[PDB]
Every structure is written in structure tokens, then in C-alpha cells.
């Protein structure tokens, strides 16, 4: 209950992310991967709010990857506080 | 006169628009472009066209994008003619990046709104997946010059292709006769507004539990719509706009329909959607 | 026509054959506009800034390129405004120069009379005929009608100014190609004209100047049999010394080229490895 | 027979090759350079058949990079013969 892997394949994975206490109001999700060592060019999608589960695909075998998830507010309160929550994975 | 509470809607969803839409569309970027680094050509099935179906639906809404750059530079693409099929999908990827971005401002827009934090999320759920694409083809009226057949939306422009065909062969694409005749009514920001917000409190949405505490709502709405053109446009002229925007909107959910099915078919052949199209679209 | 100017001509003819894409198919990864050198506001001596815009507008240009697929992605430049703007297509230029002097230096390489010559003269004449080499392949794609350049899938054409045709032509560049193309040599002609040029003794560098000089005389003779042989004599009496002429301004091109080349890179340095090898 | 670095600093670096063998045969030499383990894109520039010295700059400091040239000949006779000569530095 992080961010956690749900499942994963050597090429695929599936995250979870707990709903967290201020959908009131976030509006998206910006959801991050890249090979966890630098070099490769940052990949991201966003999911709604309403979402705990998300597919990050494409993913090359024994590879170490880096996921990162970023909370977008609505204008107006948080909850002027947020973090990113992350993990790192070898497939 | 305008009730008191009327007006404290209106002010709200004033408020949302300029939180949440970005008329200059200044903060779309890193977004695809076709030539800058989808589907494979079908040689040749027989249960496809599926393919002849798909380009029937995207012929009639070709378009021409226009990248002005800072500096005053003009990159212009000018897509190719059909050839089957592939050719035909070389705008699309880029229209995905440009639907997703219109999204977040319109969940942005819901979310501000008082009226909509207050229902319960399995129904707020509920009228995003439904109202997303009816919102954000509003929004693009707004920016679309009627003349020149363009959408400006600041450093970018798409202006559909001639038709030869003629205006004959453009009206009869539903889309484009609802930005034509939605265009020429001449709508007020208020109005735009309110008709976004009628848009987003439908309680015929599929998914929709709490159908009485949406339907009031709507209804709010729709007095203080009726009630606006009756206080700030001369009513002998101006007494059968509020019916028209109505009908405009009965339009716009056929318009949706028709829109999720075209999408379909599209999904079936090469899988175009981002991950918030889908979500918002049922995937 | 004798038979050691027809084996010239059938050299060199194959030598154009092996070493020019007519089709720029093999012109790939260039840098393109939106995909250099900071703005001025300090200077007092610059000044030299206004030079490289009066000597770069003349020459303004719209890129045009036609995708496999059918599309058409087209780049109209910046108006002048103040600074920068001016350079936006000069780092997509240097990559098209590049791409074009491979093809020359192959050219040269290929030819007998060339191989022959000693190193030491064979870097001289390639570092003061390859913009003239280059230039004589360009007006071959050269459009008089349209003002513009068919390089294959890209296209180059000259922006408005009217301004011209009277300020265009007073741009000794444009006037060159203009009534080059009027001339409407034979393919034997230009690459004749390409051989003159390529072997000219006049050139900084050269030390065996005797034995340069007897082979441009030899290919210029080579070039006005082949006028007197294959083009009715009356009317085309005089387009020997016409060509001779326009090489004459086209070696005073180079010499204003290269002057505005050094302006160019004491701005900023747009110039390939290649190409600084050669200026 | 051997490519070399004359000098180098750990911006800049100075390569120097022996003169085959061949020319007739060589229009230019493709000289190439990027950071030797995979991710990032390769860089190329040509240099005409009559050098022996060229420049690489814009390099990163203490860092693993791989440096090749390779000859391309007029079309016609080599020298049907080829290798490209390679060297590893960090500077
Ligand atoms: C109004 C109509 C001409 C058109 N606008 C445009 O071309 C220019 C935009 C700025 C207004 C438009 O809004 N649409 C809606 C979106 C669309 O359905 C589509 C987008 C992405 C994907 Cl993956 C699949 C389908 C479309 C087929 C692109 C048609
Ligand atoms: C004929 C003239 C209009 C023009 N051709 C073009 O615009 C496109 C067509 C030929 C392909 C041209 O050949 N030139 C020559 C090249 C040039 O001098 C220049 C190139 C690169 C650099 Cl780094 C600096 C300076 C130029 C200023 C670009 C003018």
C-alpha cells in the first residue's frame, strides 16, 4: 500500500496506488517511468483521479525502471502540500 | 431582474472557466506531430472495411495544422489525399495529445464547481465519462472563426480541408454543422458557460445513481440560462435563442453517441487513445 | 568531334552519373527550423550584423517538404524583426552543403586527369571549385518559372520582395542562375562547365600551374566543339563565350561568397568540419 | 594502421590517424563518437580524404566514449577491402 506492483511480466507491469485523502480535489494523475539510470528520455501519462490502477507498458526484459506519481490539484486548496510517491523495479 | 442565486452560479462558473481554460493553449506542448518521429496497411481482408466505414466518418472532418513559432516562423501541414487507409490516420496521434490536454481542463473545470464536489464520486465518475467530449467541443466553438473554417488555438491552427463537395457536402456532417450554427447564434461567455454546465449535470448519463439530485441541478441551470437572455439581450429579438441553445445540446449528446461509436471503430483498427481517453471513454 | 574529347565527355558524363543524386534521395538527418547564434542588444561594432542581414535577405528562401505518404510540411521564414531570426535555415544549409560536397569530392575523385595530379594540388582545386561545382548541380533542379529548387522530396523558393525582379536579379547569386537556366545547356555543357571550373590554375595553392591550365584549355576546347557539333551553329554561335562568361562570374561569386561566409561565422559558427575544411 | 589522441582535455580531444594505403580511393572519412555504453544517440561528422587530424568537443568530464572513422571510397575501385579503426577514452 504505497505505490505497489500488482503483477508484472518481464515487458509489463501493473500499479496500485492507494486512493489517496484529497480527491477533493485532485484532477489527474501524472504517472512517470524511465530506465532507472538516466539516459533514456523520460516517458508520462496522465490517469483521472478517480483511478487507483494504471498499465505501464513496453518495457525491456532484466531492466531496472524507475515509476514516480504525481497528484495535479484543482485550482484551489490541496487536501500547499503534496509529495510524489515512487518505486523502482527490475522486470 | 437576475436572482441572487442565479447570479452566484454564474459568477461560479465564470470562475471555472478562467481557472481552468486556457484560451491561448500555451501550456499544450511536447505533443505528437505527423512526420516527426501508425496502423499497418491492410493487404487485403474481407471482413475489412470495417476500414471503409472509418474513412467515411474521418474524410468529412479533415483538417490542415499551423504551427506559428515565437520567433514568427510558420511550419504548415497539409495531410495527404486517401489513398486507403493508413494516410488517413497521420493526424490522429497528435489528436489524442490535444483531446488529452482538454480534458484535464475540463475535469478541472467540474472539480472547482461547487455543485460537483458536493455529489458522490460513483456519480461524479458518471458525468465526466459522459459530458468530457461535449465540454471540450464547446470550448473549441469558442475559438472557431466561422469564415475561415479554423480553429484558433493560439500557436496552433486547424482549418478543414476544401470539401468539392462544397458547403453542401460539410453541413452534412453533424459536427461541423453544430460549430457553424452554434458560431452564428453569437453566444456570451455566461452562455457558453451555463451551456457547459448543462452539459455536465445530465441525469440520462448511463452510470448515473443519484438521478434527482442531478436532474435539479440540470434544471437550475437551465432557469438561470433562460433567465440571463431574458436580462441582458433585448427579448423581442432575442425570445427564441434559449430554446435553440437547448435544442443545440439535444445535438450534442447525439453528436456524443454517434462520437463514441465513430471512436470504436476507429480503436477496433489501431489503438489511438491515451490512457485518460480511455478511462473517460470506457477502456 | 575527336575521339580523346569524346572520351573526356564520356568520362566526366559518367563521373555526374556516379556521384549526383538528382533525387537528394541519400540527403537524410538534417537539422530543420523549429526542430542559433544569441541576439545583440550591446554592441557598437556590430554593425557587422547589419552587413550579414543586408547580404542574407536577398537570399531568403521557403522550405517545402513533401512526405512518402502524400503530406506536405512547409516552413514560411521569420521577417527580419531585429537579430536571429535571420540564421533560422542556415544550420539546415550547412547540412545541404555538406551533403552536396561529398558528391563533388566524388566527382572529382572519379575523373582520370584528377586521380593523376598531386595531392597537394588536387586539396587546392577542390577547396576552390567546390562551391562553383556545387552551384552548377543546383541550377540543374533550378525552376526559372516558379524561382524554386527540386531537391526530390525538398523544395527550395525564393520569397517575394517586390523589391523584385529588379532588386532579385541586382542579387548577382540569383541573376546566375536565372540566366544560366535561360542558356538551356545540354548535360554534356554543364558538366563540361563543372570540368573548366574544377581545373582552373588561377586558384590560391596551385603549384603545378602548367600542367592544370593545359587541361582546363583542353575541356574548354572540348566544350565549344561540342556547340559547334551538336547545336545549329548560326543561332548558337555565340554560347561558347557566354558560358566562358558566366564561369568568369561564377568564380567572382566564390570570392563574394567566401567574404560572406567569414561574416556569417564571425557571428556565429554554422560552417560543418567539411565545410571548414574547404573555406 | 592505428587511430590516436594527441590531446585531450575532459571537454575537448584531438584525434590523429595515419594516412592509408588508400587514397585514390576515399572522398571523406565519416568520424564518429558517443558514450560508449548504448543509450545515447551516436554522433557523426565527415572530414575530406586529405586530413589526418580532426576535433571532437562538447565532451563530458571522467566519461566513458567510443571513437570510430570510417572510409568511404569513390565509386570504384577500393584501395572491395574495408575496416573502420576504433579507440576508447574518458576524459
Ligand atoms: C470538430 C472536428 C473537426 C475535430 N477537430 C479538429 O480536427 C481540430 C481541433 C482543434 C479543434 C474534432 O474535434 N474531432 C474530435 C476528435 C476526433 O474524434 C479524434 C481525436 C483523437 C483520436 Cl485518437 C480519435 C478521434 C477527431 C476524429 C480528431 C474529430
Ligand atoms: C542559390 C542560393 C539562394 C542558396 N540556396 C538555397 O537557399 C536553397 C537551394 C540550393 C538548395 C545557396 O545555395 N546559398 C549558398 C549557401 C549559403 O551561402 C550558406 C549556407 C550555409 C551556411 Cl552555414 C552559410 C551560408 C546561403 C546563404 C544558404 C546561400
Same mark, same amino acid.
Given at each position: 500500500?504505497?505505490?505497489?506492483?500488482?503483477?508484472?511480466?518481464? !515487458?509489463?507491469?501493473? =500499479?496500485?496506488?492507494?486512493?489517496?485523502?484529497?480527491?477533493?480535489?485532485?484532477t489527474?494523475?501524472?504517472?512517470?517511468?524511465?530506465?532507472?539510470?538516466?539516459?533514456?528520455?523520460?516517458?508520462?501519462? !496522465?490517469?483521472?483521479?478517480?483511478?487507483?490502477?494504471?498499465?505501464?507498458?513496453? %518495457?525491456?526484459?532484466?531492466?531496472?525502471?524507475?515509476?514516480?506519481?504525481?497528484?495535479?490539484?484543482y485550482p484551489?486548496?490541496?487536501?500547499?502540500? =503534496?509529495?510524489?510517491?515512487?518505486?523502482?523495479?527490475?522486470? | 431582474?437576475? !436572482?441572487?442565486?442565479?447570479?452566484?452560479?454564474?459568477?461560479?462558473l465564470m470562475d471555472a472557466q478562467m481557472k481552468t481554460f486556457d484560451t491561448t493553449f500555451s501550456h499544450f506542448?511536447?505533443?505528437?506531430?505527423?512526420?516527426?518521429?501508425?496502423?499497418?496497411?491492410?493487404?487485403?481482408?474481407?471482413?475489412?472495411?470495417?476500414?471503409?466505414?472509418?474513412?467515411?466518418?474521418?474524410?468529412?472532418?479533415?483538417?490542415?495544422?499551423?504551427?506559428?513559432?515565437?520567433?514568427?516562423?510558420?511550419?504548415?501541414?497539409?495531410?495527404?489525399?486517401?489513398?486507403?487507409?493508413?494516410?488517413?490516420?497521420?493526424?490522429?496521434?497528435?489528436?489524442?495529445?490535444?483531446?488529452?490536454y482538454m480534458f484535464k481542463g475540463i475535469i478541472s473545470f467540474a472539480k472547482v464547481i461547487?455543485?460537483? #464536489?458536493? /455529489?458522490?464520486?460513483?456519480?461524479? =465518475?458518471?458525468?465526466?465519462?459522459?459530458?468530457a467530449?461535449?465540454l471540450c467541443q464547446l470550448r473549441f466553438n469558442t475559438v472557431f472563426?466561422?469564415?475561415?473554417?479554423?480553429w484558433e488555438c493560439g500557436?496552433?491552427?486547424?482549418?478543414?480541408?476544401? !470539401?468539392?463537395?462544397?458547403?453542401?457536402?460539410?453541413?452534412?456532417?453533424?459536427?461541423?454543422?453544430?460549430?457553424?450554427?452554434?458560431?452564428?447564434?453569437? /453566444?456570451?461567455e455566461e452562455?457558453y458557460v451555463?451551456m457547459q454546465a448543462?452539459?455536465l449535470?445530465?441525469?440520462?448519463?448511463?452510470?448515473?445513481?443519484?438521478?434527482?439530485?442531478?436532474?435539479?441541478?440540470?434544471?437550475?441551470?437551465?432557469?438561470?440560462?433562460?433567465?440571463?437572455?431574458?436580462?441582458?439581450?433585448?427579448?423581442?429579438?432575442?425570445?427564441?435563442?434559449? %430554446?435553440?441553445?437547448?435544442?443545440?445540446?439535444?445535438?450534442? #449528446?447525439?453528436?456524443?453517441?454517434?462520437?463514441?461509436?465513430?471512436?470504436?471503430?476507429?480503436?477496433?483498427?489501431?489503438?489511438?487513445?491515451?490512457?485518460?481517453?480511455?478511462?473517460?471513454?470506457?477502456?
Open positions: 500500500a504505497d505505490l505497489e506492483v500488482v503483477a508484472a511480466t518481464p !515487458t509489463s507491469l501493473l =500499479i496500485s496506488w492507494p486512493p489517496p485523502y484529497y480527491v477533493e480535489g485532485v489527474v494523475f501524472r504517472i512517470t517511468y524511465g530506465e532507472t539510470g538516466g539516459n533514456s528520455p523520460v516517458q508520462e501519462f !496522465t490517469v483521472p483521479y478517480w483511478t487507483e490502477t494504471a498499465t505501464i507498458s513496453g %518495457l525491456k526484459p532484466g531492466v531496472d525502471y524507475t515509476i514516480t506519481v504525481y497528484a495535479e490539484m484551489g486548496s490541496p487536501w500547499m502540500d =503534496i509529495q510524489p510517491i515512487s518505486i523502482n523495479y527490475r522486470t | 431582474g437576475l !436572482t441572487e442565486e442565479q447570479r452566484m452560479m454564474i459568477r461560479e506542448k511536447n505533443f505528437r506531430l505527423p512526420g516527426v518521429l501508425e496502423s499497418l496497411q491492410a493487404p487485403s481482408r474481407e471482413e475489412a472495411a470495417k476500414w471503409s466505414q472509418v474513412r467515411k466518418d474521418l474524410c468529412s472532418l479533415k483538417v490542415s495544422l499551423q504551427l506559428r513559432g515565437e520567433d514568427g516562423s510558420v511550419w504548415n501541414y497539409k495531410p495527404p489525399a486517401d489513398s486507403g487507409g493508413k494516410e488517413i490516420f497521420s493526424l490522429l496521434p497528435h489528436m489524442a495529445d490535444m483531446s488529452t461547487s455543485y460537483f #464536489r458536493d /455529489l458522490p464520486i460513483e456519480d461524479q =465518475i458518471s458525468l465526466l465519462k459522459g459530458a467530449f461535449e472563426n466561422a469564415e475561415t473554417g479554423t500557436r496552433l491552427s486547424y482549418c478543414l480541408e476544401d !470539401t468539392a463537395g462544397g458547403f453542401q457536402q460539410l453541413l452534412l456532417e453533424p459536427m461541423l454543422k453544430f460549430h457553424y450554427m452554434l458560431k452564428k447564434l453569437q /453566444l456570451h452562455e451555463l448543462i452539459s449535470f445530465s441525469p440520462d448519463r448511463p452510470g448515473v445513481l443519484q438521478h434527482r439530485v442531478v436532474d435539479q441541478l440540470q434544471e437550475q441551470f437551465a432557469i438561470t440560462l433562460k433567465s440571463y437572455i431574458e436580462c441582458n439581450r433585448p427579448q423581442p429579438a432575442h425570445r427564441f435563442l434559449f %430554446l435553440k441553445i437547448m435544442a443545440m445540446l439535444t445535438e450534442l #449528446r447525439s453528436i456524443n453517441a454517434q462520437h463514441t461509436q465513430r471512436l470504436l471503430r476507429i480503436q477496433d483498427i489501431h489503438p489511438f487513445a491515451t490512457p485518460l481517453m480511455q478511462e473517460l471513454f470506457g477502456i
